[PDB]
Structures are given as C-alpha cells and as structure tokens.
Nucleic acid binder design. Structure first.
Lengths: 61, 82, 80, 85, 205
RNA sequence: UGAAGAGUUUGAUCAUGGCUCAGAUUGAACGCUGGCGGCAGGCCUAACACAUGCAAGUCGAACGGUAACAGGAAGAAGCUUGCUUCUUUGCUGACGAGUGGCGGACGGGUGAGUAAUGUCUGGGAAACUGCCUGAUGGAGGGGGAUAACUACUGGAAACGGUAGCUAAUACCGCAUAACGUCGCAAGACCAAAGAGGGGGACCUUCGGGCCUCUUGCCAUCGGAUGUGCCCAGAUGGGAUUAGCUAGUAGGUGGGGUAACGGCUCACCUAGGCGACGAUCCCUAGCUGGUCUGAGAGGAUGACCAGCCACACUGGAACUGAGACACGGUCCAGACUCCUACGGGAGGCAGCAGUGGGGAAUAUUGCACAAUGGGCGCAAGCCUGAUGCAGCCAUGCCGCGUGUAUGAAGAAGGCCUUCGGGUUGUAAAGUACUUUCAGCGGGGAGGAAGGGAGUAAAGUUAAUACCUUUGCUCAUUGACGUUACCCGCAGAAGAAGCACCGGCUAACUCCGUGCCAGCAGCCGCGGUAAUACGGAGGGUGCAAGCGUUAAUCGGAAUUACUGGGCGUAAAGCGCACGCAGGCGGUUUGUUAAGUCAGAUGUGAAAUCCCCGGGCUCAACCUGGGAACUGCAUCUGAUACUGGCAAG
C-alpha cells in the first residue's frame, strides 16, 4: 500500500505509479509514499509552494 | 623482452610519461619492474622535461633489456645536452 | 637450517611419518590476550625413531607425499 | 571467422597426424624394451635399448619429447636392465 | 558564482557596515541602517548558541562574497595548516585577489574589485589574471593593464581610498597605480571585530 | 590538529532503554530548475537474446608462383614518324589465393563459478622459460614429398573426392659430437638453413663460385623475464551442520609429468582429519585501496592498478616456448537460422548499437598524429588497445549572470494603530565595465621521428655496400575553424530551489474549519492556523536545489580502546569436574613471549608533507614521509613461559 499525498487526487485503478518509500505515520503500515508527477500520475492542481515535491512545474510567473 | 618503454599518466590533453622498465607482454599501463625517470613532453622551460637515471638504464640494457623507441631519443637528448 | 621449527610429536604410528604439533603464542589481534595457537604439521621421520611426546627439530623439504613436506634434522628430547 | 585461425587449424591437424605417428613409433621401441625386461634376457633387452636410444633421443632433440623425458626413458630402462641380470 | 547579492538588507541584518556600497553611504543617506530588513521591524533577535555563529560566519562570507562551497573549502585548507585555525581563515581570505585589489585602494567595493578582476583589468606578476579567487602570494606586484589604466574607475575610486586606512601588510604606490602585497597579513593589523572562535565551532560540529 | 548534541515514556524527575533528528559520502534515481568551461565517471538489474558494422595480423630479404595492378621488356601491328593499338614473358616494382615463419596464450571484456593449494604477507625447492642478452663452438652431404597449379570431379549447399603438378628456412634420413643426456667409469646416442646487399679482385658450366657485408640457423652454458610447484600465518555467516574419511593417510615398487608429489596402478600398513570447528549448508572473486570515524573499528571492493576465474551449458584434448585456448578443433545438449529436409551454419562476459529487464546508465564517432603492441632488415601494414571527439548537471573545481550613484523612499503590492512602515537604493533614471556565450582576425604546444643527400679513420673492396654518428635539405596532428591573445556591440543572452511552530537560520495576512490536508520527530487541522492551501516578507543553498535509497557517524546502542547482570534486560537450581584460562616465593638456566638495534621486504598509484606546472582551483606531478606488517640476524633478561633445585 502506498499513500497518494498531495493537494488533491488524480490516479485511477490501473495507472502505473512510481513507489518511493518514506513511511506514513497514521495508517497501520502505509510505508511507501507514491511519487507525484513522475510516471503516469499527474501533478497537483494550482500548487505554488514546494512545487517540486509534487508533479507541477512553474506557472509562468 | 624486457623493454624500457613509456607509460602515459597525465591528464587529458596534457600527457606525462614515466620511463618504465617492463616486459613487452604487459599493457603499457599494466605491470612493470622498475621506474627509472619520467618524461613531461610540455616545454618552454616550465621545468626539467626529463630526469632519467642513466645508471639503471645502462644496467638493464646490459642485462638484456630492449630500450624502446621514444626513450632512445630521450637518452641522448640528455647526453647531447649533457 | 631455516628456522628449525621445534615441536612435540603427537602420533608416531604411521609408517616413516610423524605428526609434530608446534605451539605458538600470538597476541589476539582485536582483544589483546596472548592466545596459544598450535600448528600441527606432518613430518617425515625416516626410521620411526621418535616416540610420542618429545621435542624435535624439523625442517622444510620438498613435498614428500600428499601433505608431507617436513623432515626433522635431530631430536633433542626423549619421549619418556 | 578469421583467416589466421582457419589456417592454423588445418596446420594443426597436419602436425597432429605427423606428431602422432612419431610418438606411436617411439612407443613401440620402448615396449620392445619392456617385452624383454619382462622376458628376463639381458642381451635382447640390451639390443632393444641400444636401438631405442636414438629414436627416443632423436625426436627429443627436435620435437615431441624434450631432453628430460628422453633422459627419463633412458635412465629408468638402464636401471631396469642393470637389475635384470 | 556571485549571485547579484543581497543589497543592503544584507548589512542591515548583521548590523555592522558590510561594504557592498561605499561612498557617502557610511552615514544613512538613504540606507536606513537597522530599521527593518523586512516584514517585522526591530523584532528582538532571540538567536540560539547556534544563531550567533551563523550570524558571524555569514558576516565573514558576506563581507567578501565567498560562498558555502568556497567558504568550506577555505575552512578545510585553513584547518589543515599549522597554527590558529581562525587566523588561517582570515589570512587566506585576505590573500584573495578580489580582496587585495580592494585593499590596494583600487575600486570602491569588493564587487567592483570582483568585476575589475574578472574584466582582465588587474594583472599580477606581469601576466593577466581574471580569477577572483587567486590567492595572492606575498611579494607579488599587482597592477592594472594598459587598456584599463585610465578606463573609468581607478582614477576616482583610488581617490576614495586615501581617507580610508592604509592596510599595513601591503604598500600602495598610488601615484604609479601598481601595488605590492609585501608580506602575510596578521590578525592584529587586520583590525576587524570578527570573532574567529565562533566560526571555527560552527564548522567543527 | 584530535572527540558537541537534540527531541521523545511522567502531574511532574532521577535513571534505564529503544526510536527519531542534526554531519559526511554515493557508479545513485526521481521532482522543480538551468548559463559556461575544466578534470573525472557513466547497465549496480537478465553471465538474458543478440540484428549490423568494426575488435588480428604481418613478412615476396623462405619458396612455388601471377589472380589481378602497375613498371615495363620483347614482339605483331596504328603510323599515332616514332609516337601507341595489341600478343606473350613474372623479366621488374609489387601482389590475390597456396605452402612457410612468427603473432592469434598478449592486448580488450565480465565477475558466473570459487569459502579455498583462490587472494595477501613471508619463506622454499624438485622446474621449464618463444622473443632479448654474454660466452663457446658448429653451420658438410642426401632423400622422398604435398598443398599451389592442371584436368576430371560428387554434393542444393556446407563441403569434397580422382588423376597428374610442384618447390622451399616445409618434412625426413646420413656424416655429424661435447662444455650435452644415459652411465660408477668405459662406452652409447643425439642436431642444423639459408637468405639477401655490393661485387673491390678473380673465376664462372657465366648458374654462381669465391672475398666480403648484413641477418638468420643448430648445440651447450649462464643472464634476465615470465610461468609451474611447495610450506606457514591471515583471509565470511551458520554447531538449529559433530562427526568426516578407503586412493582415504603412509610405505614399498612400477608407470606418469618440464618438475616433487596418490599424480595413477599392484601390494602392504590402518591410518588421517575434527572443539585451536573437520564435514555439511548459505553467501562471496581477492588485494592495494574507498567511504566513515578523534581513533580503534565499521561498511565496502564501480573507477585506476596486481592476482584469479570464465568465454552459449557440459566433456575432452590437439598445436605450440607457453592454452585445455573470447573472435581455434572434435564431441555432446539447449537453442537461432539455411536447408533442396537429405543436411549445415552461429555464439557481443570485445567496441558501437538492438530487443528485453530495470527507478536507472551514453555514439551502429575520428585517427592510428602520440603511447604501446603484433609481423618486417626497413619503409610499412594491423590495432573498437590508445589518443581524442559526441551524449548525459552524474560528481568535483573555477567563473558568469553586471558595477557604481541614486528618493523624499518612484509607483504598484503586503499589511497597517492607517500613522506609515515594508518590499527598498531595490526600481527607473543617472556614469561606467565587457569576463563567459556571439561575431572577426591573430594562434602555440602535444613531433620525437622517418625520407633524400652529405664524412667516416668504422667494415672489408681502398672507396663498394652496410653501420652509427655529424652535417644539409625537404616532410609527418585525429583532436582541431586547439588552448591562448587581440578588435566590435551593449548591460546587452544567463536564477532557481527548498524552507520559515521546536529540534534549526527565518513570520505576518487571508481562505479553510478534524474537512481538505501536512508530517523526520514532537505534533498540527473542530471557529486566526507563525504547523494545512494562497499572498507578502525573511532565511539557507546556489546551476543548482529538494525527496527517496545506501553506508558510517552520532550509537559508550556488541562497550578492545569503551557497558552491564539486588529491584530497570541479564548470576545456570546446586554441585563435581576433563579440556581450557589464571597462578605464592628464592636461586640457577634458557631466551620462546617481551624489549632494543640491524638487514631485507612491505608494487605503482592512492593518504599526508615541502614543492612544481596548468591565469586559480579541481587536476597533473617531483622528492620525502608514511605502508602502524612479515621474515631473518645480533644484543638485553626486568616481567611472562620452559627446564632444575629448593
């Protein structure tokens, strides 16, 4: 099991995702923490800060 | 076939050669027997380009060692100079 | 004559051959206690002329059989 | 592949056959000595050896054997003849 | 490399005048020394036993414009030498060409010295050097090449230097506009309020 | 020159004790971002399968030779008046295929196997060693061939068979004879090759002999170098592997190898190995070194170098100085493919690339100019070694993105007590500079050498020839429109990333309202929340910056340095006792431990030191130091051990 953290959700039931590590502290053993925005899982919506930890990239600014 | 060839050791675009005594069958940057002097092809009196230790070369040559091509010139360019 | 490894014969039964057990200190590399490490080593004795438990003076020779590369020069103690 | 190897191959087959003939010839002039050692005749073994001595030493000079196996076969047959009779 | 710098909100944080700007800027004259570096005004700074060596390490880095990679390299090659580690840091920071061209009196701030150096202007031992990190060995004779002898700057910035103190470990023949870093600077004559024995604990964790 | 701690069990604290964090490093990967350049790395996974190209040849001075090419020679002919269309000649340079010599055993790859006769250190004997080197001699004579080539000639092919052909430095006899081998000694026996260059001078059946030159040849003894063999010590985890072993341990003899040896055979002895860990199982190439650490230690072994092992899987051997042999042979098997199905062909753990697997790792480059290697008498050929280029922020280092001056603090935003402050001299404007990228021109060094002549007493022929020198002339750079320098522009093309509750440098406003979410830990979110999301502001690092993974540290948390066991985890229920571990006191002795000194050795590079050269640095490099070890020798004799006397 892998946690899908971010500011909103975008996956599906067969999309291939890139597992990362870095346990989550609440679920009884969700100790992998899916990467955002690397493989076929999109970034997050309208997210400006710590934008690298999520799959969104440089609104024009 | 003990040889007195040269091994290329300096960085890219700037070779530095040790005058090595090694047999032929080893890759030039493989094994060897004795390291008698070096050769730094760069010039314009940066430093001595060659120090060579002629007595061990003379010993090895008299012992059956084939003094190689470039180092043959290296020998007398020292003797001709001094 | 190399270092003539003194030892105490363990078993002179086997024909024209003996088993000499050398004993050695060595400081334990990691803890520092002088431990006693034995060095059992087959010796060719030509006449079965040494009995168990007498210090002999053995030497390196060419291999003489499979695992037998030492012969003794002279005996310096009687078994009993 | 290479043109070298497929000439060194046929060359080695030719040398195989020729070397083989030489060694299976010498392994007759040693067994003729043995068939007299076991026969227990001093004289017949003496001729067998004095005819062996060129053949085992001839190709040791220039081929298959070299001086040490020629020496071995000379020596450990002179020794066997001596203690025959 | 140099990163265009924090301007005077740089020197405002440390309090003392960190010379990015030099002229009549010593008095306020539009500097607003310690009114606020930003959002909050004179908020009391509750620096921890850590914060008061980060403050001084980045007083030193930000006097000269050195960076964390170069400043740690300077730290390590000051800590492998012999003697007082802190005075070794200040020695090998003072021998830097970017610095020396300033202490010579050439230019008006070490950003101007870093630009003159980078633009071939300063030429040491008769051969042009445009690396700002070039550790000036003692007895060198720094100069200015012919093309930049009268370029625009060193004619006036030098006149902005005589009222300034004369660093006693190097001599300045301003009339001919070539100098000589005569000997190794010491801690005493390098009259700064810099406490080395905060920096050295910062790095020696 | 060397050493830091913080949070977290409680109402609370003193201790225990784990857990988490702060540092450094990586063959890294991923996310956002990106201007240079230098130096260095770049399938860690499937030792999975490999398209396609290259990765190994060379010498016509070994010899038959001409398959071409050329120099031609001759000749028939076009006259094309002496020019060039043809036919033969290997007659010549030269050279395809063939025999021959040497090199394909190095160089290059990989780390599957190997837990140890493999590796490291240190000794040793029973050995060979192609090429190179010194000494000594020999270097006469003869034979039978067989590919090439010819002509038949099966087989779809792969690949062959018949008949002639033919030389050699191929092959084999003969005389050949120790400084050789066998043998106690006598005796016996054992090899070989010519090739060119010029012929002074001579002969010439004008072959050539013969003089000479050069080089090669056979034999023996040295040398060096390489390799084989041996012994000792040290080299992972598991005792929830405690017994293993019959050629197994030893001895006689044969036999076997370059060489000792159960290496193999017959026989006899009945041993050997094991708690100081044998056998079995799992994992693993080993080292110099790398990282980390105050250090002891820990973890590793990509790069670079030494050794090893493998070359589609499994057997074997040939040839040879050397192989049980990556681009060699026979055999099996799995495969991939051609197949006329009767039969054959192949092995990227070379380089570049392909498919696959993977989070992940590059070009189907240029040159052999340098260095090295192979063959060669040399010119030279060959070299996916090597040198360079390409891609990749993968690292490290250096630089740049402007510099000065500048307010009523320009607006505009943020907040705001609306006072203003802040963003902030920051902007704009003011004067100036051009380093990198751009354009243009200047522009090394890496090239020493080799070629052609020239003096030689050298060599003999005296110059001939050859040899080296000395001189003269011309000539060789992939990279590379090289570094570097100089002119022309204009600030002109060059800034992001994380973070801001504490641990930790750095807080304000708004929206959200246990929801969305965060999170390394403590812990946040239920009506302001400096902890989520957004803005302003700040902090840190900067062509980077974050996250994940991995190692050591912190962790004294396996504690040798350096911990504990009444109650925190932890004294066997209690004894006896083998092995083991320790041992009162005096003298003598030894000199094993120990200590001192010395001698070898501890590869080079790494690490450190004083330098030196790249405009600095990374980087390269000289010399030293260091390699804390091992072995040998000579002293001491206090302490420990032995032996003897008490």
């Amino acid at each position: 099991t892998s946690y899908i953290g971010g500011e909103g959700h975008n996956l599906q039931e067969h999309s291939v995702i890139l597992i990362r590590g870095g346990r989550v502290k609440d679920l009884p053993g969700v100790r992998y923490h899916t990467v955002r925005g690397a493989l076929d899982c999109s970034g997050v919506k309208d997210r400006k800060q710590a934008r690298s930890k999520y799959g969104v990239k440089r609104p024009k600014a | 076939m003990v040889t007195i060839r040269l091994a290329r050791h300096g960085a890219k675009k700037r070779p530095f050669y040790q005058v090595v005594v090694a047999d032929s069958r080893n890759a030039r940057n493989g094994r060897f027997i004795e390291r008698v002097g070096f050769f730094n092809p760069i010039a314009s009196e940066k430093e001595e380009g060659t120090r060579l230790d002629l007595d061990r070369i003379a010993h090895w040559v008299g012992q059956g060692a084939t003094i190689s091509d470039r180092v043959a010139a290296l020998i007398k360019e020292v003797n001709k100079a001094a | 004559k190399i270092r003539t490894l003194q030892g105490r014969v363990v078993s002179d039964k086997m024909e024209k051959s003996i088993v000499v057990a050398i004993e050695r200190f060595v400081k334990h590399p990691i803890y520092g206690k002088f431990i006693k490490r034995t060095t059992k080593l087959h010796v060719h004795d030509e006449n079965n002329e040494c009995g168990i438990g007498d210090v002999v003076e053995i030497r390196e020779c060419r291999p003489l059989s499979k695992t037998k590369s030492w012969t003794l020069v002279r005996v310096v103690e009687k078994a009993v | 592949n290479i043109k070298s190897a497929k000439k060194r191959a046929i060359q080695s087959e030719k040398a195989r056959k020729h070397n083989a003939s030489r060694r299976s010839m010498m392994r007759t002039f040693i067994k003729k000595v043995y068939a007299a050692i076991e026969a227990g005749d001093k004289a017949a073994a003496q001729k067998a050896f004095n005819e062996m001595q060129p053949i085992v030493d001839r190709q040791a000079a220039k081929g298959l054997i070299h001086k040490n196996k020629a020496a071995r076969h000379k020596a450990n047959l002179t020794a066997q003849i001596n203690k025959l009779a | 490399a140099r990163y265009l710098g924090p301007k005077l909100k740089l020197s405002r944080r440390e309090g003392t005048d960190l010379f990015l700007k030099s002229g009549v800027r010593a008095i306020d004259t539009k500097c607003k020394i310690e009114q606020a570096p930003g959002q909050h005004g004179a908020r009391k700074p509750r620096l921890s036993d850590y914060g008061v060596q980060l403050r001084e390490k980045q007083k030193v880095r930000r006097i000269y414009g050195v960076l964390e990679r170069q400043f740690r390299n300077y730290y390590k090659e000051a800590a492998r030498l012999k003697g007082n580690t802190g005075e070794n840091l200040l020695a090998l920071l003072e021998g830097r060409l970017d610095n020396v061209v300033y202490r010579m009196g050439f230019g008006a701030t070490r950003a101007e010295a870093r630009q003159l150096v980078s633009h071939k202007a300063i030429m040491v031992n008769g051969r042009v050097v445009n690396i700002a990190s070039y550790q000036v060995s003692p007895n060198d004779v720094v100069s200015i090449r012919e093309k930049a002898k009268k370029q625009s700057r060193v004619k006036a910035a030098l006149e902005l230097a005589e009222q300034r103190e004369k660093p006693t470990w190097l001599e300045v023949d301003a009339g001919k506009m070539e100098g000589t870093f005569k000997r190794k600077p010491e801690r005493s004559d390098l009259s700064a309020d810099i406490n080395e024995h905060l920096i050295v604990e910062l790095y020696s964790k």
